[PDB]
Design a protein around this ligand. Structure first.
Ligand SMILES: Nc1ncnc2c1ncn2[C@@H]1O[C@H](COP(=O)(O)OP(=O)(O)O)[C@@H](O)[C@H]1O
Ligand SMILES: [Mg+2]
Length: 304
């Protein structure tokens, strides 16, 4: 299916080092955008992405870049957007920032398009789930949960997880607001979209899966050592799955969906017609350069 990788370099916070000269972002070159990281010991690293957002690029500017993507979920597509990176790099800000976030923007633009489509005779019914995966166990944020797949109807649900009907842009916003560990867990906001055209009888089923990933950094008590092993293996698994789905021979490959809760849960949104987008968030601070490079490698591997 379709996979795209955007890199976002966030701007320095007030108390952080302010110098970005170690990061060089080329203008978009007609077919990838490149960035290079220089570390002075002088080592150069280069990476290619579908798009690179600079410290000056706003949430609203970025959403214009994913708008067609998330809109395609009313067109019968399953869509996954992931935000990946080191703790502090801007994952949650990108996805959740109030009124600005990919999640708030997508929800708004969804209701607008939905309302819009009544003119064509379309009636859409929407539900959301919001869950978090911590140590490969599932927590329902809208409150035992198991993942149940129907291979014939290509669909998925989690047992005993509240699924709330979505009414207004206002009403949806309250659910989010209402709902360190979070730095260590994956948070997954899902929007189930079913529609039918009153005049035509035409049916539409689509999905949005918006994911704020556990932080990717690698550690150096044993409850923490285990936790950090789950996280690292969960992230690797996600990377292996996306990479394998991208190969030209993918239909001939084993895809290890079953190796983590996130990939198992999302399997039918990762496959077939599905569209996937991954943000790599990176901090500007040269003090974090090695974690930054790990992040960049992870995402480029997936991209390739
Ligand atoms: N693009 C951005 N513009 C302004 N502030 C940002 C941006 N990205 C992150 N921040 C801020 O930097 C800090 C870390 O971001 P956060 O979203 O918590 O990181 P993560 O989710 O990757 O752990 C927060 O204080 C957040 O408000
Ligand atoms: Mg966070």
């Amino acid at each position: 299916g379709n996979i795209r990788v955007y890199c976002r370099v966030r701007p320095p916070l007030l108390n952080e080092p302010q110098d970005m000269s170690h990061i060089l972002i080329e203008k978009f070159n007609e077919g990838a955008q490149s960035l290079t990281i220089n570390r002075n010991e002088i080592l150069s690293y280069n990476f290619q992405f579908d798009m690179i957002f600079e410290p000056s690029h706003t949430n609203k500017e970025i959403f214009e870049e994913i708008r067609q993507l998330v809109q395609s979920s009313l067109d019968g597509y399953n869509v996954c957007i992931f935000a990946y990176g080191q703790t502090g790099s801007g994952k949650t800000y990108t996805m959740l920032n109030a009124g600005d976030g990919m999640i708030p923007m997508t929800l708004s633009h969804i209701f607008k398009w939905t309302a819009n489509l009544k003119e064509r005779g379309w009636n859409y019914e929407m539900e959301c789930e919001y869950i978090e995966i911590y140590n490969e166990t599932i927590l329902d944020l809208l409150r035992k949960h198991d993942i149940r797949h129907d291979h014939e109807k290509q669909g998925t649900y989690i047992t005993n997880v509240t699924r709330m009907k979505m009414t207004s842009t206002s009403q949806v916003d309250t659910i989010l607001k209402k709902a360190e560990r979070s730095s260590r867990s994956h948070s997954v906001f899902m929007v189930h979209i079913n529609g039918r055209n009153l005049h035509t009888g035409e049916t539409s089923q689509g999905k949005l899966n918006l994911v704020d990933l556990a932080g990717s950094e690698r550690i150096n008590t044993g409850e923490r050592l285990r936790e950090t092993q789950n996280i690292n293996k969960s992230l690797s698994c996600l990377g292996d799955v996306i990479y394998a789905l991208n190969t030209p021979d993918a239909g001939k490959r084993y895809i290890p969906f079953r190796n983590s809760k996130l990939t198992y849960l999302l399997q039918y949104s990762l496959v077939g017609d599905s569209k996937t987008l991954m943000f790599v968030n990176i901090p500007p601070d040269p003090n974090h350069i090695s974690e930054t490079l790990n992040s960049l490698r992870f995402a480029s591997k997936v991209n390739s």
